[PDB]
Ligand binder design. Sequence first.
Ligand SMILES: C=Cc1cc(O)cc2nc(-c3ccc(O)c(F)c3)oc12
Length: 334
Amino acid sequence: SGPVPSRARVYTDVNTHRPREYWDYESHVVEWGNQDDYQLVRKLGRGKYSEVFEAINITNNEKVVVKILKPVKKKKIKREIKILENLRGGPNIITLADIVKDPVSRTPALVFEHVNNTDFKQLYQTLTDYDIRFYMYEILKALDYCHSMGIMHRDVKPHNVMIDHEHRKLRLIDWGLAEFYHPGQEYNVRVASRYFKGPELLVDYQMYDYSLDMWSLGCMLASMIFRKEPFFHGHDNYDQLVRIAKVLGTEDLYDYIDKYNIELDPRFNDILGRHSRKRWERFVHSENQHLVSPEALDFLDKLLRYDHQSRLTAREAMEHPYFYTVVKDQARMG
Ligand SMILES: C=Cc1cc(O)cc2nc(-c3ccc(O)c(F)c3)oc12
């Protein structure tokens, strides 16, 4: 027999209770505008699925960002668009302003609100203890929201968090890998970027959920507090699990595999070995100790579990003592 099934422990059925068209994105009709409404100013960045440009809307002279999509299935473009429309106006969610095609090339492009500066990777190795907590809290708002709206991001990583440090503002971007959660659905495990892939993805357990994003978040938190980028530095997908196993231990890994009756790719037979679960103090040194606290380690420990079911939810994470000061400072300002 095969793998034991799994269900999300929160927001399990939110898509089921919705009208069909909320999640049945293949049926969504897209009104394509004219890219000549926009003049490209400069290239901001590039990816596997898109190139991103600063641009001007010539009709009202506003600054925007244009994300020209690399060729993918129509289905996937509809998926990203529907998800962006569904989450529009949600906390710390990038705002879609328009959808266009170049009239010559016919290449599809998404147009977003202009967001001020850095990708998170440029500063997240030089933030204060408080700022790590502050921005982590802001990310959790986005994740709790999108999970509550029946959506998993599936590519949480520093490049996909845009911070305006001047205005203390954050947006979660690049919803191109996001999907609707449906209980019992088996998902593609070729998602997320290598260093942020959850064990479920690495061992090919397909019946995953929102909790995937919480592992990714844990990887980010660990790189920031211990200043080791990335925290789990694998050479490939198999070695990525080995790197995790050398920290989290092999006992919990093999219990995870047994619990869900997962069939391990034979490649893993020799390389996983036998490793203890390491205490977090092993990663604490002079330069990083000001970012590490008992609260930080307790929080981190509760994100980074093999068993997706054992990880904190976004709302549970937000209620952790690590955030108590952030929370009280926020009720102060109003
Ligand atoms: C990459 C640099 C970059 C810089 C910047 O100041 C704003 C940006 N906004 C995007 C963006 C928004 C939504 C997406 O879905 C996406 F993929 C990218 O990338 C940006």
